[PDB]
Design an enzyme around this catalytic site. Structure first.
Site, PDB file in Angstrom:
ATOM      1  N   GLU A  35       0.826  -1.197   0.000  1.00  0.00           N
ATOM      2  CA  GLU A  35       0.000   0.000   0.000  1.00  0.00           C
ATOM      3  C   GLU A  35       0.870   1.262   0.000  1.00  0.00           C
ATOM      4  O   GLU A  35       0.631   2.177  -0.790  1.00  0.00           O
ATOM      5  CB  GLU A  35      -0.945   0.006   1.209  1.00  0.00           C
ATOM      6  CG  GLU A  35      -2.092  -1.002   1.125  1.00  0.00           C
ATOM      7  CD  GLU A  35      -3.158  -0.609   0.117  1.00  0.00           C
ATOM      8  OE1 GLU A  35      -2.975   0.409  -0.582  1.00  0.00           O
ATOM      9  OE2 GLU A  35      -4.182  -1.317   0.025  1.00  0.00           O
ATOM     10  N   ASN A  46      -7.250   8.911  -5.965  1.00  0.00           N
ATOM     11  CA  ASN A  46      -7.999   8.122  -6.931  1.00  0.00           C
ATOM     12  C   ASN A  46      -9.153   8.952  -7.486  1.00  0.00           C
ATOM     13  O   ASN A  46      -9.490  10.009  -6.950  1.00  0.00           O
ATOM     14  CB  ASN A  46      -8.492   6.816  -6.304  1.00  0.00           C
ATOM     15  CG  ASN A  46      -8.889   6.975  -4.853  1.00  0.00           C
ATOM     16  OD1 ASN A  46      -8.065   6.815  -3.950  1.00  0.00           O
ATOM     17  ND2 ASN A  46     -10.160   7.281  -4.617  1.00  0.00           N
ATOM     18  N   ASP A  48     -12.212   9.448  -7.729  1.00  0.00           N
ATOM     19  CA  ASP A  48     -13.474   9.894  -7.149  1.00  0.00           C
ATOM     20  C   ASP A  48     -13.231  11.115  -6.263  1.00  0.00           C
ATOM     21  O   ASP A  48     -13.995  11.395  -5.340  1.00  0.00           O
ATOM     22  CB  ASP A  48     -14.139   8.764  -6.357  1.00  0.00           C
ATOM     23  CG  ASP A  48     -13.216   8.152  -5.322  1.00  0.00           C
ATOM     24  OD1 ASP A  48     -13.014   8.779  -4.261  1.00  0.00           O
ATOM     25  OD2 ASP A  48     -12.703   7.038  -5.569  1.00  0.00           O
ATOM     26  N   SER A  50     -10.824  11.717  -4.123  1.00  0.00           N
ATOM     27  CA  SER A  50     -10.426  11.366  -2.763  1.00  0.00           C
ATOM     28  C   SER A  50      -9.012  10.804  -2.753  1.00  0.00           C
ATOM     29  O   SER A  50      -8.485  10.404  -3.792  1.00  0.00           O
ATOM     30  CB  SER A  50     -11.395  10.350  -2.156  1.00  0.00           C
ATOM     31  OG  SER A  50     -11.222   9.071  -2.739  1.00  0.00           O
ATOM     32  N   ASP A  52      -6.029   8.300  -0.573  1.00  0.00           N
ATOM     33  CA  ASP A  52      -5.692   7.284   0.417  1.00  0.00           C
ATOM     34  C   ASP A  52      -4.467   7.756   1.197  1.00  0.00           C
ATOM     35  O   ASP A  52      -3.483   8.195   0.600  1.00  0.00           O
ATOM     36  CB  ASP A  52      -5.423   5.935  -0.251  1.00  0.00           C
ATOM     37  CG  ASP A  52      -6.605   5.436  -1.064  1.00  0.00           C
ATOM     38  OD1 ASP A  52      -7.762   5.749  -0.706  1.00  0.00           O
ATOM     39  OD2 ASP A  52      -6.375   4.725  -2.065  1.00  0.00           O
ATOM     40  N   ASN A  59      -8.719   5.695   3.097  1.00  0.00           N
ATOM     41  CA  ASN A  59      -9.411   6.577   2.159  1.00  0.00           C
ATOM     42  C   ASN A  59     -10.281   7.625   2.846  1.00  0.00           C
ATOM     43  O   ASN A  59     -10.911   7.353   3.868  1.00  0.00           O
ATOM     44  CB  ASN A  59     -10.275   5.753   1.210  1.00  0.00           C
ATOM     45  CG  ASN A  59     -10.901   6.594   0.117  1.00  0.00           C
ATOM     46  OD1 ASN A  59     -12.002   7.115   0.274  1.00  0.00           O
ATOM     47  ND2 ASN A  59     -10.196   6.735  -1.000  1.00  0.00           N
TER      48      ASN A  59
END
Ligand SMILES: [Cl-]
Ligand SMILES: [Cl-]
Ligand SMILES: [Pt+2]
Ligand SMILES: [Pt+2]
Length: 129
Positions: A35, A46, A48, A50, A52, A59
């Site tokens: 990750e 990402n 949308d 938003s 991480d 997220n």
């Protein structure tokens, strides 16, 4: 901060991620590796609108708030920057709630693709715990 492999494992152990909700510590180390590459400051956006955050890439759509993401709920009641600290306490605490949210560690994409079903025991090799 960039963690060492067993260094992170020690911290995760202390906060009790070892075998938490049926996931041995190795799963959590493997997750962090793929990750964030052991980097607590890692951030990835990402499509949308938003991002991480942190060592375990939490997220901001549901779990933390950056004031940047739409329809955010902040279910961990914490700013997203708290998940960037060298101290992983903020991430581990929030992670415990996430893994209990009816999906297990499948919430973490990198874990599902690169850790799930594998000999996770390997991620804690060489470690003194
Ligand atoms: Cl605790
Ligand atoms: Cl060690
Ligand atoms: Pt060590
Ligand atoms: Pt803790």
């Amino acid at each position: 901060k960039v963690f060492g492999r067993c260094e992170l494992a020690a911290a995760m152990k202390r906060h009790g991620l070892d075998n938490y909700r049926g996931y041995s510590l190795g799963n959590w180390v493997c997750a962090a590796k793929f990750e964030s590459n052991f980097n607590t400051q890692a951030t990835n956006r990402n499509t949308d609108g938003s991002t991480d955050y942190g060592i375990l890439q939490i997220n901001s759509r549901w779990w933390c708030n950056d004031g940047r993401t739409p329809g955010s709920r902040n279910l961990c009641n914490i700013p997203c920057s708290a998940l960037l600290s060298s101290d992983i306490t903020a991430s581990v605490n929030c992670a415990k709630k996430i893994v209990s949210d009816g999906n297990g560690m499948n919430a973490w994409v990198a874990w599902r693709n690169r850790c799930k079903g594998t000999d996770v025991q390997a991620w804690i090799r060489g470690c003194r715990l």
